DNA sequence: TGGGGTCAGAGTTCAAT
DNA sequence: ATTGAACTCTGACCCCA
């Protein structure tokens, strides 16, 4: 599948667990490392509008079945 | 078969011997490019980073060392098919 | 075996915002 | 700080004698 499974952005394999691009994989490595957490509950995450709601976005990534164990430690 | 051995280096499964010693498949795939390209490596800290399965990427130079310390032998590493 | 190889999916960088 | 396009590194899983 070449479609991001979050936002529709066209895809770069699979990330954590989910056909995902390079951004959604990007900001939930970011999430997980930072141990960030973010306020918004349903916002629409596509392409254009994906970074508009860091809290939506993280929930979908999530939704859409991205692991958290598979982000490893910084190196 | 996994059943008889550990790594010597991450403490990660063994199949058996690599380059002169009981490693993982990431410490023998580590071990095999850093010699193939001559790479040199350099530790942030004190040089005695923890390496273990989880931590063991963390740093380059702390693997290598322990890599020569537990006996891997760079001759081992063949030339590039 | 214990030498070899591959490449998906982990990693990182850094210009642009 | 944050994003993401475009890179490097890793290691599970193969191939042989
Ligand atoms: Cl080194
Ligand atoms: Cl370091
Ligand atoms: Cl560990
Ligand atoms: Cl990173
Ligand atoms: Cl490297
Ligand atoms: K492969
Ligand atoms: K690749
Ligand atoms: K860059
Ligand atoms: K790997
Ligand atoms: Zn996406
Ligand atoms: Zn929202
Ligand atoms: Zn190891
Ligand atoms: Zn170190």
Redesign the interface.
């Known amino acids: 599948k070449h479609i991001c499974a979050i936002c529709g952005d066209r895809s770069s394999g699979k990330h954590y667990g989910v056909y995902s691009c390079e951004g959604c994989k990007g900001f939930f490595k970011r999430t997980v490392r930072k141990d960030l957490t973010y306020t918004c509950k349903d916002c629409l995450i596509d392409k254009r509008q994906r970074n508009r709601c860091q809290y939506c976005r993280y929930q979908k990534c999530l939704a859409m079945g991205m692991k958290r164990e598979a982000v490893?430690?910084?190196?």
């Open positions: 490893q430690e910084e190196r």
